[PDB]
Design an enzyme around this catalytic site. Structure first.
Site, PDB file in Angstrom:
ATOM      1  N   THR A  93       0.815  -1.208   0.000  1.00  0.00           N
ATOM      2  CA  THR A  93       0.000   0.000   0.000  1.00  0.00           C
ATOM      3  C   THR A  93       0.853   1.265   0.000  1.00  0.00           C
ATOM      4  OG1 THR A  93      -0.198  -0.336   2.392  1.00  0.00           O
ATOM      5  CG2 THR A  93      -2.065  -0.988   1.006  1.00  0.00           C
ATOM      6  N   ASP A  94       0.277   2.345  -0.542  1.00  0.00           N
ATOM      7  CA  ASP A  94       0.999   3.612  -0.634  1.00  0.00           C
ATOM      8  C   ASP A  94       1.236   4.223   0.742  1.00  0.00           C
ATOM      9  OD1 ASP A  94       1.051   3.432  -3.418  1.00  0.00           O
ATOM     10  OD2 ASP A  94      -0.865   4.485  -3.620  1.00  0.00           O
ATOM     11  N   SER A 119       1.873   8.683   4.694  1.00  0.00           N
ATOM     12  CA  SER A 119       1.280   8.867   3.376  1.00  0.00           C
ATOM     13  C   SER A 119       2.374   9.281   2.406  1.00  0.00           C
ATOM     14  CB  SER A 119       0.174   9.925   3.407  1.00  0.00           C
ATOM     15  OG  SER A 119      -0.335  10.167   2.108  1.00  0.00           O
ATOM     16  N   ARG A 120       2.513   8.543   1.302  1.00  0.00           N
ATOM     17  CA  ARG A 120       3.562   8.867   0.341  1.00  0.00           C
ATOM     18  C   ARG A 120       3.144   9.966  -0.626  1.00  0.00           C
ATOM     19  NH1 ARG A 120       4.076   2.953   0.487  1.00  0.00           N
ATOM     20  NH2 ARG A 120       6.031   2.482   1.575  1.00  0.00           N
ATOM     21  N   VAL A 121       1.888   9.968  -1.077  1.00  0.00           N
ATOM     22  CA  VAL A 121       1.461  11.012  -2.005  1.00  0.00           C
ATOM     23  C   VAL A 121       1.482  12.366  -1.313  1.00  0.00           C
ATOM     24  CG1 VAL A 121       0.154   9.527  -3.551  1.00  0.00           C
ATOM     25  CG2 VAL A 121      -0.942  10.417  -1.481  1.00  0.00           C
TER      26      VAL A 121
END
Lengths: 128, 236, 264
Positions: A93-94, A119-121
Site C-alpha cells: 500500500t501507498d 502517506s507517500r502522495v
C-alpha cells in the site's frame, strides 16, 4: 469499479476487510491440499492481495482521466503489525492510517496514531 | 428457537453457554477427518463453520431474537483464532478479565475492553454518552499513570493527576455489583439498579458531589444512596 | 500480551533513565548544598550563643519553607503535614508557607484561614541577602507586635538519608525588650537595638532554616531517586522474564504449525 474508472468517472472502493478474504483463501487452499506457508497461510497470498491492489490508478488523458481509489481495511490481532498479512499489505500500500486502541479509550477519537501513520502522495493530494 | 421465531410468531430469548466449545469440537474431529491443521491446530473451516452456525441467530421481519453467547477464551488470550473470529458476529461485547477478578472485584467486567453499537448519542441521549465517555477516559488515564505510580508512589503526581487517580479508583470500585445469584458466594444481598439511577450516580461521582467518601464505601453496593448508607455504616 | 509487556518495558526503561540522570545530578549538587549548610550553621550558631547568654524564653506567625522543586521524596509534603497538625493543635496561630511543595500541601489543609504569599525561591541554594530581604518582607504586612508568638519550621538531616522536621521560635522585638534572664547583658535603651536585633534574628534564622532544609531536601531527593532506580530495576527484570517466555511460546506455536505442514 473499473467501469467507472475506464469511462472517465471517479470511484472509491473500500474492502472491509482483506484479512478475512485471506482467511477464506487459507481455508479454500488448505482443503485443496496445497502446501501451507507462514502461519499456515497459502504460499501465494501476496500474489492475491497485489492483484487486487494494483487495479487502483488515475488514468492519463489518453483514457478519459478516470480514477479508481482503494481504501482497504486490516484487522490486526493483538497489535501484531509485523504479522504476515499486515506485513504484505503494508509492503503493497501507498500509505497507512494506523488506529491505536489506547488513544481511542483515552478519548482522542477517531484515534488516528499520527506518529505511526504515513502517506507517500502527501502534499500533492491536499488542497492548496 | 427458529421454529418458535418463524412459526409461533413470538419473540424469543436464546441463551448459549458456552458457544466456544462448538468450535473446539470441530478441532477434535479435524485431524481424523483428514484436514490439514490450520493456525494453532484449528480446523481450516473455522470461519465458515461459525458462520453457518451463527448467521442463523438473527432477528427477522417475522420476529425478534435476543441472544446471549458466552465464549471460553483459551489461555485467556483473546488473540486466539476462535474468539478473534467470534468478535465479528456480536453487536455488543463485554470482556471478562482475570486482571480485575483476581483483585476480587466482581463481576470483573473490563470497562475499557468492551463495546456496543448502541453506545452513540443517537440512542442513549447525550447526557448518558458524556458520562460514558468521561468514565472511560478517567479509567484509561488511571491505567496510563499506573506504570509511573509503581516507581514514584501515589505522592509523586501533580494535583490534577492525583485527583484524577482518586476519581478513577473510586469509579473502578463503584462498577462492582452484588448479583442476586451470587449471594451464595458473597453473603451480600442482590442489588438491581435501573439505568437512569446508574447514569445519575456516575454523573454525580464525576461532578465531585461525592468526592470525600473513602474507597471502601463504593465496593459491593448498588446506587449512590446505598453508597452513602454504607459510608455511614462503616463510619460507625 | 506480548506487545503489552513490550510497551510497559519501554515505559519503565524511560522512567529508569530519568531516575539515573537525576540521581547523578542531585549527587553533584549535594556537596555545595552541604558546604553552604555548614557556613550558615556556624554563623547562626554564633548568633544562637549570643541569644543563649539571655536564656531566651517565650496571632502567632509560623513560617515554614520547603523547596518548590518536586521529584523529591514525600518529606517535602511530610513537613507541611507535620506543621499542619501543629496548626490543628493550636488554632490561634497563623501559618506562612515559603515554597511551592509546602504551598500545595497546605492548600489541601488550610487554604484561607491564613495567607502568606511566597514562591519562586527554590531554584537555587540559599543566600544571606535573600533571607534578609524575605524576612523584611514577611513581617512588613503583619507587624511583629501583632504576632508576639513566632515559629520557624525547617527540616534537618538525621543522617545522609534520614530527615527530621523541627523548629526554633523567633524571639519577638517585644520579647527582646522584656530581657528575660538577660539582666547581665550590656544594653543601651536609647538605641533601636531591640528591633534591630529582632530583624537581624529573623534574617539569620530564615537563612539557617533555609540552608538546613535545602541540604536535607537534596539528600532526600538523592535517596528517593536511588529507591526509584531500585524499583525500576525490579520492574524491568520481571517484565523481561515474562517477555521472553511469551516470545518462546508464540515461536513454539509457529514451529508446530510449520512442522505439521511439512509432515503432510
Amino acid at each position: 469499479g473499473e467501469w467507472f474508472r475506464d469511462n472517465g468517472k471517479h470511484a472509491l472502493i473500500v474492502y472491509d476487510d482483506l484479512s478475512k478474504q485471506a482467511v477464506a483463501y487459507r481455508q479454500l487452499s488448505l482443503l485443496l491440499r496445497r502446501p501451507p506457508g507462514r502461519e499456515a497461510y497459502p504460499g501465494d497470498v501476496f500474489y492475491l492481495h497485489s492483484r487486487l491492489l494494483e487495479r487502483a490508478a488515475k488514468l492519463s488523458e489518453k483514457e478519459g482521466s478516470g480514477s479508481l481509489t482503494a481504501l482497504p481495511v486490516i484487522e490486526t490481532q493483538g497489535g501484531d503489525v509485523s504479522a504476515y498479512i499486515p506485513t504484505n499489505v503494508i509492503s503493497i500500500t501507498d500509505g497507512q492510517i494506523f488506529l491505536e486502541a489506547e488513544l481511542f479509550y483515552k478519548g482522542i477519537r477517531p484515534a488516528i496514531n499520527v506518529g505511526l501513520s504515513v502517506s507517500r502522495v502527501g502534499s500533492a493530494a491536499q488542497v492548496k | 428457537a427458529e421454529y418458535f421465531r418463524d412459526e409461533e410468531g413470538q419473540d424469543v430469548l436464546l441463551f448459549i453457554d458456552n458457544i466456544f466449545r462448538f468450535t473446539q469440537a470441530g478441532s477434535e474431529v479435524s485431524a481424523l477427518l483428514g484436514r490439514i491443521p490450520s493456525a494453532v491446530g484449528y480446523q481450516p473451516t473455522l470461519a465458515t463453520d461459525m458462520g453457518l452456525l451463527q448467521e442463523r441467530i438473527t432477528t427477522t421481519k417475522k420476529g425478534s431474537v435476543t441472544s446471549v453467547q458466552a465464549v471460553y477464551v483459551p489461555a485467556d488470550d483473546l488473540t486466539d483464532p476462535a474468539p478473534a473470529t467470534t468478535f465479528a458476529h456480536l453487536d455488543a461485547t463485554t470482556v471478562l478479565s482475570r486482571g480485575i477478578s483476581e483483585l476480587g472485584i466482581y463481576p470483573a467486567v473490563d470497562p475499557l475492553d468492551s463495546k456496543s453499537r448502541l453506545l452513540d448519542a443517537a440512542v442513549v441521549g447525550q447526557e448518558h454518552y458524556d458520562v460514558a465517555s468521561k468514565v472511560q477516559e478517567t479509567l484509561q488515564t488511571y491505567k496510563s499513570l499506573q506504570d509511573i505510580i509503581a516507581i514514584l508512589g501515589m505522592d509523586e503526581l501533580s494535583e490534577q493527576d492525583k485527583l484524577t487517580v482518586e476519581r478513577a479508583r473510586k469509579i473502578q470500585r463503584f462498577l462492582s455489583q452484588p448479583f442476586a445469584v451470587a449471594e451464595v458466594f458473597t453473603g451480600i444481598p442482590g442489588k438491581l439498579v435501573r439505568l437512569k439511577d446508574t447514569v445519575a450516580s456516575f454523573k454525580a461521582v464525576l461532578e465531585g458531589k461525592y468526592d470525600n467518601i473513602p474507597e471502601h464505601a463504593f465496593y459491593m453496593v448498588g446506587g449512590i444512596e446505598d453508597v452513602v448508607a454504607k459510608a455511614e455504616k462503616l463510619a460507625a | 500480551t506480548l506487545k503489552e509487556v513490550e510497551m510497559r518495558l519501554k515505559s519503565i526503561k524511560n522512567i529508569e533513565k530519568i531516575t539515573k540522570t537525576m540521581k547523578i545530578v542531585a549527587s553533584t549538587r549535594l556537596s555545595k548544598a552541604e558546604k553552604a549548610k555548614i557556613s550558615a550553621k556556624k554563623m547562626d550558631e554564633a548568633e544562637q550563643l549570643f541569644y543563649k547568654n539571655a536564656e531566651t524564653k517565650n496571632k502567632e506567625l509560623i513560617v515554614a519553607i520547603t523547596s518548590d522543586k518536586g521529584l523529591c521524596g514525600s518529606i517535602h509534603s511530610q513537613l507541611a503535614k507535620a506543621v499542619r497538625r501543629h496548626l490543628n493543635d493550636q488554632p490561634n496561630a497563623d501559618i506562612v508557607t515559603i515554597g511551592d511543595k509546602i504551598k500545595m500541601q497546605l492548600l489541601r489543609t488550610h487554604p484561607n484561614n491564613i495567607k502568606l504569599s511566597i514562591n519562586g525561591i527554590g531554584k537555587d541554594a540559599p543566600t544571606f541577602q535573600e533571607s534578609a530581604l524575605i524576612a523584611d518582607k514577611l513581617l512588613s504586612v503583619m507587624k511583629a507586635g501583632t504576632y508576639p508568638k513566632i515559629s520557624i519550621f525547617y527540616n534537618d538531616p538525621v543522617s545522609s538519608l534520614s530527615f527530621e522536621p523541627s523548629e526554633k521560635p523567633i524571639f519577638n522585638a517585644k520579647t527582646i525588650e522584656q530581657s528575660p534572664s538577660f539582666g547581665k547583658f550590656e544594653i543601651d535603651t536609647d538605641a533601636n537595638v531591640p528591633r534591630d536585633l529582632f530583624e537581624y534574628t529573623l534574617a539569620n534564622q530564615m537563612l539557617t532554616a533555609m540552608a538546613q532544609g535545602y541540604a536535607a531536601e537534596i539528600s532526600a531527593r538523592r535517596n528517593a531517586m536511588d529507591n526509584a532506580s531500585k524499583n525500576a530495576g525490579d520492574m524491568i527484570n520481571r517484565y523481561s522474564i515474562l517477555y521472553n517466555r511469551t516470545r518462546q511460546a508464540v515461536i513454539t506455536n509457529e514451529l508446530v504449525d510449520i512442522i505439521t505442514g511439512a509432515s503432510s
